[PDB]
Amino acid sequence: TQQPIVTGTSVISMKYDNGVIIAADNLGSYGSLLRFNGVERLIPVGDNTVVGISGDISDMQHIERLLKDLVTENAYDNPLADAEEALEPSYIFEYLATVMYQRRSKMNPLWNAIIVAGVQSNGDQFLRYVNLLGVTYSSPTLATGFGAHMANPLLRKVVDRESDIPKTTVQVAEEAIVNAMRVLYYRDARSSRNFSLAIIDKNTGLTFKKNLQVENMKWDFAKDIKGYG
Amino acid sequence: TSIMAVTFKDGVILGADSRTTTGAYIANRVTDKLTRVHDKIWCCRSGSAADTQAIADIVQYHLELYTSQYGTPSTETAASVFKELCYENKDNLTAGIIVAGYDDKNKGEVYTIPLGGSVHKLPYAIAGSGSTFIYGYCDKNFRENMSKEETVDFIKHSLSQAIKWDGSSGGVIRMVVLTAAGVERLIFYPDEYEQL
Amino acid sequence: TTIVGVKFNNGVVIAADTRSTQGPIVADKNCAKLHRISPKIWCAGAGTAADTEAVTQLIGSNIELHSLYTSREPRVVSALQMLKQHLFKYQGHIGAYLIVAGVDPTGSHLFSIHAHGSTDVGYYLSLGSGSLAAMAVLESHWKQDLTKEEAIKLASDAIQAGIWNDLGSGSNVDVCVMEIGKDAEYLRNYLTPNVREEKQKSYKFPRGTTAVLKESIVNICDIQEE
Amino acid sequence: NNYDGDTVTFSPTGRLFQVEYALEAIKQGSVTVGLRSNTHAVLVALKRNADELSSYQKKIIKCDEHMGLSLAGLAPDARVLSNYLRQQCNYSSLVFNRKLAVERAGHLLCDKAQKNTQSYGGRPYGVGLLIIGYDKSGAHLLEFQPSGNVTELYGTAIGARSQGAKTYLERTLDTFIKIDGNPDELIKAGVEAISQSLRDESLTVDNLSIAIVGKDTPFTIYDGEAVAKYI
Amino acid sequence: GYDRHITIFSPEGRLYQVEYAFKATNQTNINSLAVRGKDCTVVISQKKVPDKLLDPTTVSYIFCISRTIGMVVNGPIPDARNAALRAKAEAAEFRYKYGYDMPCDVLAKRMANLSQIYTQRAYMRPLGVILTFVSVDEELGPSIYKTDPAGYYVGYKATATGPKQQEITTNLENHFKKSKIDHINEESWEKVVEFAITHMIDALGTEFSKNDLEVGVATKDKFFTLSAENIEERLVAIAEQ
Amino acid sequence: MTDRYSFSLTTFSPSGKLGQIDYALTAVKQGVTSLGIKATNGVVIATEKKSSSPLAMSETLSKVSLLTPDIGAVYSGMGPDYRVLVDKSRKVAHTSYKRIYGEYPPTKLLVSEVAKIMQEATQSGGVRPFGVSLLIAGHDEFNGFSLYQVDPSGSYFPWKATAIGKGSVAAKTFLEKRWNDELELEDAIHIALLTLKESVEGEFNGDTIELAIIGDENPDLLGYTGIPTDKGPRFRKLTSQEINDRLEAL
Amino acid sequence: SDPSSINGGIVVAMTGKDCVAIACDLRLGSQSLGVSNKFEKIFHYGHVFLGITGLATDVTTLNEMFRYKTNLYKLKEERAIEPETFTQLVSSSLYERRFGPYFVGPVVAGINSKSGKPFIAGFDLIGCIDEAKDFIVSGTASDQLFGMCESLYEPNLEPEDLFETISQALLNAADRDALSGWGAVVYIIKKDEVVKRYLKMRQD
Amino acid sequence: MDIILGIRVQDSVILASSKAVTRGISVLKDSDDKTRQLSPHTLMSFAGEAGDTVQFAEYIQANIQLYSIREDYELSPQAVSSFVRQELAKSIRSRRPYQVNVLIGGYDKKKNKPELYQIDYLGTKVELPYGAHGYSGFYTFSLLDHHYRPDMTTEEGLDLLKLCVQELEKRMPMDFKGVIVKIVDKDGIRQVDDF
Amino acid sequence: TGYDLSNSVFSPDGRNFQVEYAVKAVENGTTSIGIKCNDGVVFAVEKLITSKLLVPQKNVKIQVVDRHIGCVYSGLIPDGRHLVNRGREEAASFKKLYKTPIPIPAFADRLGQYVQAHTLYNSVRPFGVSTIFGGVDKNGAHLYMLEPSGSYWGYKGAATGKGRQSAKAELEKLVDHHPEGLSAREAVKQAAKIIYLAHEDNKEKDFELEISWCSLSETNGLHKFVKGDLLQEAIDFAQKEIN
Ligand SMILES: [Cl-]
Ligand SMILES: [Mg+2]
Ligand SMILES: [Mg+2]
Ligand SMILES: [Mg+2]
Ligand SMILES: [Mg+2]
C-alpha cells in the first residue's frame, strides 16, 4: 500500500476505419503544484503499439522499463523478431494486465491506469484498458481519469457502436481527439496545454506527434462577466 | 531546507542552505547538505536526514565499487542507483534528492528524484520546503549556457529569497562548483546575501 | 539530561550532568552518563538510558575487535558509521541520542547522532532536555581557537545552565578531556555544587522498635562435609 | 571407464559417458517417425507391447492444441519433459495471450536437459523426443536429444532401426514437402517411411499410432480402428 | 591416496593440494618485483603477448583494487581475476562499514584468511595465485604485503615473485646490505621506477622494450598504472647514464 | 555448487586411531619451538621469529598475540591456522562472555572455548583439524596466574612450564631442572631466554626473538585516566631493546 | 491493563557498615483481589540476593532463568558469582528482550567475597543499571519508598541499626499503597552470616 | 467457563466446578465436567476462553500421561504445577495465547500431604489452602477466611464448600447450573454424585 | 594418479586436468571465428549439414545478448546456450541498476567469473565450450574469446573449433596486411572466406555459412544477422577465393 506522489492525468483514445488514435498531455503534477512540464506519457512499443499511462509517474517509469525489457527479451533467439514473431498489441496488453492484477493481489499496486492502443497482424484494431486493480475492458472509445467523464461523451458521438467504426475516417477521428484535449484543458485543473498524439494505421503505420498545443481557445466572453450576482 | 542545482556553460553548480530543524528549534545552523558520492558527482539532500544520509552512503559505496570494476560512472548511472533505492523502498523512505555531476563527454547534468522515486532530467532543479517560494523567480531568471559568475549570482539570489520566506531554511549558503578544472567550494554569509 | 561537546586547540572535551529520572522522580542522584567506546573515544547519551548504554557497549565491543584485527587504534568515524547503520536499521526504535567525541591518528573529532540514524558535525554541540539551556551558553561564549582550560570552563558552564534551569537535569558535572598525543582524562564529579545540607533531626531508631514474628539463620553456604 | 561414474566428469578425450549412456536408451526404444509439408506436420509411431496379454505402450503426447511430441526411451522421463512443455505452453498463453513458438519450445527443452549434465547428484534424461507443431511461421518438426541438442528438420526418425526410415525420407524429401492441403497423403508418406524400419512384424490396428497438426487442424492422436484406413 | 586430492593432512602433516597450488602460480612464466621509495611504492611485472591476434591493451596482471591499493598477481588469469573481484568487493565494503579506506595490510590479512579457509574446507580448492598488494598507507607509509595459497602473509621492505624470484631477491638483498636502510632514498617515483627496472634487468640479464614491461605506482591517495609511452620515457633515462 | 561434503573427514581406523588428528600433531612437531614458564608474580611466553626472507619485515608477522588485556597466546605449527584461531578466540571472548558478564573471561574458560572450536574441526562435516598447538598464558582475579596448552584434538592441560614444536623434548627437560615454586618473573624470563637459545640455530637477539609477559597491571598502557578500578592490561610484549638488555646478563 | 501494576508489591535495598540489607512485601493480587500473603520476592544464588517486583509470572520466570544461568556459571567457573558480575548478567538478559520485555523491576544486593565491599544495584524493565551508594527502590510504592529512604537513611549504619531503618522504610511505604503489604521480610547480610526476619504488620 | 473453586483440608483436596456451558443467548448444556485427570493422584480444573480450555487441558493431560509411561513414575503435584506454569508463561508471549486459568489439586504420596495450586493464564502460580478464579473468590473468600482450619476433615471441607456455593447462588447474576465436586486423596480421585 | 577424476583438484604439476579435458570437447566442435573491424565486430560460424532433411537457415547458432553483443561458440552447444542465458541475466541486472547497457569488458568479466567458478568445486563440471563474443560500447569495438578455464583476453581476431589453426593463420595475415584497419563490409567478406578455408578440416560433409555483425556505421551499434543479398555476395566472394 502506498500513495501516488508525482502524477499524470487523462489518457484518451478511439478506433477509426483503418486503425486507432491515442493522446495524453505532458504534465507531471506534485499535488496541486504543476511541477514537471516535459513528461512523455505515450510510450511506443515497436511500430504497431502505443501504451498510454496515467497515475503515478515513478510507477510509469518502472512500466516503461518493463516494456523496454520485453522488446529485448522477445528478440532473444528469435529470427522472426521483426516479422511473424514480433510483439503484438494483444501480447503487450495481456502481460501488463497480468502484472497489474498480481501487484494488487500482493497489496502493493502499480498506481496507474493504462490504455494499450495498436493494430494486430491481420489489420484488426486493438484498444483495451487496465488499471491498478487489474480491471480490464474494451470499447470503441476509451479514456482514463477526467477523460472518462468528459472525453468519452464527445468521442462516443462519432463512434457510438461497432458499426460506426468503418464509417469513421482518420481526419474525423483526429479532429474529435484534438477537440477533447481542448475541453480537458478548459476543465481539468491538473492538465496542461502541451500534449502528444499517436496514430497507428494498418496502411501508413505509426505516426507519433510531439509538442502539440491546444489552440482555437474561446476566452473573449470572459470580459463581459462581472461580479457573482 | 532550500536546495538547487543549475547547469551552465562550463558544467554544473549545486547550492544549499545550512539549517536543520527539530520543530521550531534549530538543531544545527551550519549543516553541510551538499554531499559527495563521487569525485565529480554530488547531491543535494532533502527530507529525512537519517534516510538521505543512509541512501547517500549506500550510493557512494555502489559508485566506489563501480569505479573499481568499470571506471568512472556517468551522472545518469549515479541517478539510476539513487532511483533504485528510492523507488523500491518508497514505503519506508522520505527522501527528495537532486543529483548533479560533470562528465567530459556529457558535461554538466542535473537529475531530480522526488518522493515517489521517479527520475527527471532537467536543465536546473529546485527542491526542499523553501523551493516553493522561488518557482516564479527561478523560471523567470534561468537561462541556458550562463557563465560561472552568472550562475553563482542566480543561485545566491534564488536561495536568498527561499531563506527569507522559509523558516525551515537559513544560515550560510554553501555551493559546490563542478567543471573540467575541478571541484570548488564556496560559502556566503548572512551579512552578504541578506542585503541583495 | 544535559550533555555537551566542545572542540579546542589540541583536542575535544565532553561533559554531562549526573541526574537520571523516571518521570518526575529522581532515580539516581549521581549517574554516570560519560561512556567509553574506546580508551580515547568517549560519548554521552540522552534518551532511553538502556539503549544509550547498550549501543555504546555493542559498538565499543566491535570497535575493540576491529582495532585488534587491523592493528590500528580505533577511529571516531568508524564508531560513528557503525552506530548510525545500527540505529537506522531499527528505524528509531532504539532511542539512543549521542554526542560522540575522541582523538585518533587522523586528529580530534566531534559528532552528534540521532535515534533514526542521522549524524552531524560541529565545533560545539548539545543534547538532551537541557540542550537549549546549554546551547544558549555555548552560542554566547564560544570562539575559535579555545585553549584546554577555556574549553573545560565553557563545557562545565553549559552543563551548569542545564542543571539550574532544566528540571530534567541536576546534581554534578562530569567531564572528559581528550587531547591529541595524551591519555584521555576522565574527571568524575568535576564540580559538586549540590550537596544536601545537614538534616534538622537524626532518625536513628531505638533498638527493638520494630515488631518481629520470626527469626532464622539463612544458609548461604554450600552443602557441608562429614 | 574410470570417467563414467557420474555426469560431472569429462573423459581424457572430452566425452561425457553418462550422457552417451542415456543416448543408448533411445536406441533401444521403439521406432517413431516425424515429417512435415508446408500445411501439415505428422508423427507416426510403432507402439511396443510387453506380451500378447498386454497393451501397447503409448508413444505420442499432446502438449497444446497446436503442439505435441512422440517419445523413444524412458517413458517416465518423457512424462516429466512433456509436463514441462505443457506448463511452458500454458504460461505463454496465460501471461502473453500467445501460442508458444515451436522453436522457443526447443530452446526451453535444451536448457532443462543441460542442467542435468553439469551438476553432481543428478542424471541425464533417458529419452528422445520428436516435437511437431503449427505456429505463426507454419508447420515445424524438432528432434530432441537428452544431451541438450535440439534440431529443426523436414523429416526424421529415432529409436531402433530408425536409419531405414531416415534414408527413405532423405530420398522422398522433394515429394512429401509438396503435399500441401492433403492430410491423408502426408500420413501415407509417413506410414510408408516407418515401414522401412520394420522386421518380422507388420503394422496392425493396435500397433500403429499416428498424430497430425496443421493449418486448420488441432493436434489429434489416432489409435485403434482410426488407423485401419492407413494399414 | 585421496589425501592428495583434497585439503586434508598427509601422514607427514603436509597439505599437497596447497603445495600444488604454489606450482600453478608459475604457469604464466612471468616475474614481478616491488620496492618502496620515500613517498611511493612501485611494482613492475613482465608482459608477454605471444599471439599476434591478441589485443595487447587487454593483457594485464596488475589490478586497481581501490583508489589507494594496487595488486599484482602471479598465477593464471582466471584465478587472478577471481581474487581481483573479491578484493575490490572487500575494500568497498570496508569503507562503507568503518568509514575509512581499507589499509593495504588489512586487505592482505583478509584475503589471506579467505585463502586459509580453502586449505581447511574440503569443498573449496585453493586459488593458484600469489597476490602482492601495494599502497602508501596513511599510517604506515609505503607498504608491500604479499599473500600465497597457504594463507600466509607478511610485510616487505621489497619483494619478488615468479620462476626467477630468487635471482631478483638476492639482487635486492645485496643492495639493502650496502645502503643499510629499508627503502630507496629517492624523492620522485620516476626514479624509483627506474631503480626497479634497472635491478630487474641486472637480475634477469635481459633487456626490455616498452611492450615487455608493466608498471604500477602507488602514491599518497592514488595508485595508477603507466602507459607504454610512460615506460618508454623511463627506459630512455636508464640508457642515457 | 553447495558444500556437498556433509560427512566427517576424520574417522576412527581399526586400531582406534584418529588419523587426521595424529597427522595434525605431526605438522605441529615440524613447527618452530615455542615455550611458556609460570612464575609466582607472572607468566612468560616466547618463540623464535623464523623469518622466511631477509627482505620480509618480520615485525609485521606477530607470533605472540593479545587475546584479552590479561591473556596472550603463542603457537607451533601452521601459521595461517593460528591467525584465524586468534581472530575466532578474540571474538568468542566477547560474544560468549564479555557481552554477557561485562568482564573478560578467566584464562581457563577462554581456553575452553578455543578448545571447543578445535574439537569441532575434528568431527564436523567436510573439514580437516587445525594444524597447531597453542600455549595460552593469562591472569584473572580468582585463579591468579596460569598457563595452558591446547592441541589439535581440542584437549587442553595446565602447566607450570612447557614447550611445544621442534625441540620440545629437550626443552622440557631443561625446564624441569630449572623450575621451582619460588621463581620471580625476571628469573622466569632469564630461564626462558636460556631455554630458547638451545633450539635456535642462527641469530639470537631482540629482532629474531618474540617474547611477551603476563605480569603487573600497566596503567601507562591503558590510554585513559580517571577510573581507579581500571588499572591497565597485564599482557605486555617486550621490545627488541628490552630483550637485548637481558641478553647481556645471560 | 498496565502489566507492572496487576499483581503489586515492593522491594528495597540499603548499604551499611560492612553489611547490606534487602527487603520486600509478601502480597500477590489480581488487581483489587488479594490472592496470596506468602509470595516472597527475594531470591538468592549463593551469596548474591535478587529482589524482583512487577508482573508475577515474569518474577517467577526470571528467578528460574537466573537459577538456571548461575548454576551453569558455577559449574564452569568453579566459583560462586559475585554481585558486580551478576548485575551485568541481569542487564544483558533483560536487554535481549528489548522489544518484548519482561515487565519487572529487579534489585541486586550482596557483599563481594574477596574485597568485602557492600554492593547494591537496580534496573528498569529493559536492563538499565542504577548503581547507588545508599539505597535502591522498586515496585508499585516506589515513590513512597524514595520518600522514606531519603529522610531515614544515613551512611555507615551498624547491621542491627540498618535493620530498623530499612524495616520502617518498607512498612510505612507499603501502608500508603493499596497493592503492597500483607506481610514483609527483611534480610540482613554480613560477609559470612545472613539473618532473615519476618515483620508484623497490618493485614489490610 | 465460570466458577472453579478449590480447598485443601487435612488429608485431601476438593475441587468444585460449575456445570453450565453458555454460548451467548442460550445455555447449551447443564452437565459439563470442567476437569481432566492428569495422573491417578492429580486433578486439574479449568476455565477461560471457549475451545482453548479443553484444548489446553487435554494437551497437558497427554504430556503428563506420556511422562508417566516413559518413567513408570507419577510426578509430584509440585512438579506437574511447575510444568503447567511454564506452558502458560510460554503461551502469554505467543502469537495467540491460551486464555485458560487452572486449579491443580493433587495428593503427594511421598510427603503424604494434599496440595492445591492456583495458576492463571499469565503463568502466575501460588500454593494455597483454598483458591478460585474469576469472580468466584470475591463471593467465597470471606467465608473461607473465617471458617477454614488446616486440620479439617473431608466432610467439614464439603460443608464449608456448600456454604460457598449457596452464597454464589444467592449473589451471582448468572445461573451456573450447580457444581460437580471431586475429591483427591491418597486413594486417588472420586466424584461426589450428590451435591 | 587419480588427479584427473575430479574437478578442482590440483595435479602435482599444478594443473586442473578436468578443465584440460573440457578443451578437448571444444577442439572437437565446428569452426567459429570473430573479426574486429574499424567500428565494430563480425562473427561467423561453420554449420555442418549432417543430412538433406535439415531445414536450411533454420538451426541458428549465433546468439544475441542484450541488443549490442553477439556470442558464438564451439564445442557442446547446450553448454554454450547455458552460458549465454547467464550472460543475458548479467546484462539485464547491470542495465537495471546502472541504466547504461553493459560495457563489453564488463560483460567479459561476468562470463569469466562464472566460468571460473565452475573450476572451484568437484560438484560441477567445467564448460565444454570456448566462446567468441563482443560488440560496440561507449569506448568503441571490443572482441573477446573465453576458454573453459575462465581465461579470457581481448583480440584483434579470434578462432576456435576443429579448424582453428587454419583460421588463425588467415587472421594473422589480415592483421599484418591491414595495420590501419578493416572495414565492416570487408570483414564480412573476409569472414566468409576464412570459414570456407577452415572447412577443409571438416571436408567430408558440406556446410552452411552463418554470419552476424555489430558496426557503428552499418548497424547503428546493434547486433544483426547478415541475410539475403549481402550474405550471397559474401558466399560468392568466398567461393571465388577457394577456386
Ligand atoms: Cl577475516
Ligand atoms: Mg529563514
Ligand atoms: Mg580445500
Ligand atoms: Mg498496603
Ligand atoms: Mg484492604
Author numbering:
A (entry chain M): 1 to 229
B (entry chain N): 1 to 196
C (entry chain H): 1 to 226
D (entry chain E): 3 to 233
E (entry chain G): 2 to 242
F (entry chain A): 1 to 250
G (entry chain I): 1 to 204
H (entry chain J): 1 to 195
Publication passage describing the model:
The 20S proteasome core particle (CP) is the key non-lysosomal protease of eukaryotic cells. Its seven different α and seven different β subunits assemble into four heptameric rings that are stacked on each other to form a hollow cylinder. Only three out of the seven different β subunits, namely β1, β2 and β5, bear N-terminal proteolytic active centres, and before CP maturation these are protected by propeptides. In the last stage of CP biogenesis, the prosegments are autocatalytically removed through nucleophilic attack by the active site residue Thr1 on the preceding peptide bond involving Gly(-1)45.
Instead, Lys33NH2, which is in hydrogen-bonding distance to Thr1Oγ (2.7 Å) in all catalytically active β subunits, was proposed to serve as the proton acceptor. Lys33NH2 is expected to act as the proton acceptor during autocatalytic removal of the propeptides, as well as during substrate proteolysis, while Asp17Oδ orients Lys33NH2 and makes it more prone to protonation by raising its pKa (hydrogen bond distance: Lys33NH3+–Asp17Oδ: 2.9 Å). On the basis of these results, we propose that CPs from all domains of life use a catalytic triad consisting of Thr1, Lys33 and Asp/Glu17 for both autocatalytic precursor processing and proteolysis. This model is also consistent with the fact that no defined water molecule is observed in the mature WT proteasomal active site that could shuttle the proton from Thr1Oγ to Thr1NH2. The active-site residue Thr1 is fixed in its position, as its methyl group is engaged in hydrophobic interactions with Thr3 and Ala46. Consequently, the hydroxyl group of Thr1 requires no reorientation before substrate cleavage and is thus more catalytically efficient than Ser1. Thr1 is well anchored in the active site by hydrophobic interactions of its Cγ methyl group with Ala46 (Cβ), Lys33 (carbon side chain) and Thr3 (Cγ).
